[PDB]
Amino acid sequence: PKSMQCKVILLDGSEYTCDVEKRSRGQVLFDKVCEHLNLLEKDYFGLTYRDAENQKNWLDPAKEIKKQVRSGAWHFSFNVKFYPPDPAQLSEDITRYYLCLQLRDDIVSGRLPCSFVTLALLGSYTVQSELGDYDPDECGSDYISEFRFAPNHTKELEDKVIELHKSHRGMTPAEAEMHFLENAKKLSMYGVDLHHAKDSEGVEIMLGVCASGLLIYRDRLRINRFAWPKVLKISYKRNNFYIKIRPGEFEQFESTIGFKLPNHRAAKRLWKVCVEHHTFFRLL
Numbered sequence: 001p002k003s004m005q006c007k008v009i010l011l012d013g014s015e016y017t018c019d020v021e022k023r024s025r026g027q028v029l030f031d032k033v034c035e036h037l038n039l040l041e042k043d044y045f046g047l048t049y050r051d052a053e054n055q056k057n058w059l060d061p062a063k064e065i066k067k068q069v070r071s072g073a074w075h076f077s078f079n080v081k082f083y084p085p086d087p088a089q090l091s092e093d094i095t096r097y098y099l100c101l102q103l104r105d106d107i108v109s110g111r112l113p114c115s116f117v118t119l120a121l122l123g124s125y126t127v128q129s130e131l132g133d134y135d136p137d138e139c140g141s142d143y144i145s146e147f148r149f150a151p152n153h154t155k156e157l158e159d160k161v162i163e164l165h166k167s168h169r170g171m172t173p174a175e176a177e178m179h180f181l182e183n184a185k186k187l188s189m190y191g192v193d194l195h196h197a198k199d200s201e202g203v204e205i206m207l208g209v210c211a212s213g214l215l216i217y218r219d220r221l222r223i224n225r226f227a228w229p230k231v232l233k234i235s236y237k238r239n240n241f242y243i244k245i246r247p248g249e250f251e252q253f254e255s256t257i258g259f260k261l262p263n264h265r266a267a268k269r270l271w272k273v274c275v276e277h278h279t280f281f282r283l284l
């Protein structure tokens with residue numbers, strides 16, 4: 001029985017290596033990674049791979065790994081798939097820990113934009129969680145943390161992390177991680193999966209998929225929102241992604257909104273992540 005080597009980038013930046021039977025479904029590898037991580041609340045997470053176009057795809061746990069990675073390497077990342085709107089309701093601290101690690105990468109990467117003050121506050125909770133109580137013996141007036149806090153680091157940001165770190169004396173790792181999440185969850189782009197698209201007129205937009213629904217960012221002025229309740233039907237055909245918006249009270253007909261994606265694979269990927277978000281956040 002022939003086995004394929006899998007390499008998974010974990011949220012702490014380390015690499016997990018295991019073997020699965022070459023006809024294995026994605027769930028097999030996912031269960032191995034979750035066992036390695038001592039993770040029980042697995043429903044929020046998934047594995048990603050890069051397709052032949054170098055796009056991030058979710059590994060479908062129900063389908064064979066080889067029919068997804070196809071010609072590519074058996075290289076994956078472990079990631080948060082469904083960002084819980086209320087992390088306080090997760091049953092385990094270790095779940096919240098992995099959610100923190102993902103969010104720290106969302107911030108450093110620039111996927112999750114954040115004010116100066118919130119970068120410093122999130123940073124201060126990470127330091128409290130990881131080093132414990134502020135000690136002046138480590139940090140002088142010229143201190144720069146090994147911790148990556150932001151897409152662009154400044155001395156003023158490092159200073160503000162330390163000033164807020166001082167305020168967290170006696171805070172336990174679980175407590176600091178919960179505070180991290182209470183702040184991160186409020187950011188306007190928290191758990192928003194962005195897809196480049198064009199509207200029915202050819203104007204470039206972004207489509208965001210998240211717990212509350214489908215967001216349409218036309219620019220900073222003009223943001224349309226479709227709560228999962230208000231979106232009746234989803235579809236994709238060729239390069240195009242359509243949403244069927246349920247009739248308002250006393251309106252005779254559902255309305256249809258069409259978007260143009262870069263290519264057919266981009267339209268299918270957006271369709272699938274929307275169907276999955278709708279199912280998950282309908283049930284949660």
Ligand SMILES: COCC(=O)Nc1ccc(O)cc1
Pocket residue numbers: 228229230231232233234235274275278
């Ligand atoms: C297989 O599912 C197809 C589909 O249309 N799904 C769907 C997604 C969001 C929504 O609000 C309503 C429905």
